[PDB]
Copies of this chain bind each other. A is one copy, B any other.
Amino acid sequence: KLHERLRELRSERGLRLKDVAEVAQISVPYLSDLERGRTNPSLETLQTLAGAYNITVHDLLEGVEFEGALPKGLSDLMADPTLGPQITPDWVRTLSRIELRGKRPRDKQDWYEIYLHLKRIL
């Protein structure tokens, strides 16, 4: 997918490789290699191509696709600044251990529901 995006980006602007190669550091043989998915660019190369495109590195990775330290829902509650505020890392550890052989609370609010109840009890 990443390489397919780098061709998609070039191609929808109807640019030939040699046009991108001018404005950017990159060689035509090199850009061809990256667009083929032979070798993987650095974040450096991606700035350069974002640069060529003129898009942001963030907006470059828009389509592309390619184990969690907290449960998905608990992660999201902590990420959210409006809802997270006062939850402490001690509480995060406390809340990660809540599991019934597999099943967990689903969403941020599911998690916040519990946090508040338990907060009172402990």
Contacts and interface: CB of A to CB of B under 8 A. Distances in A.
Interface of A: 90-91, 94, 97-101, 103-105, 110, 113-114, 117-118, 121-122
Contacts of A100: 90-91, 94, 118, 122
A98 B103 contact: no
A94 B121 CA distance: 17
Nearest to A117: B117
A98 B98 contact: yes
Contact of A114 (B103, B110, B121): B121
Given A114-B121, A117-B117, A121-B114, A98 B97 contact: yes
Most-contacted residue by chain B among A97, A114, A122 (CB, 10 A): A122
A122 B103 contact: yes
A89 to B, nearest CB: 11
Top 9 A-B residue pairs of the complex, sorted by shortest distance between their CB atoms: A97-B97, A103-B122, A100-B122, A94-B100, A105-B121, A117-B117, A90-B101, A110-B121, A90-B100
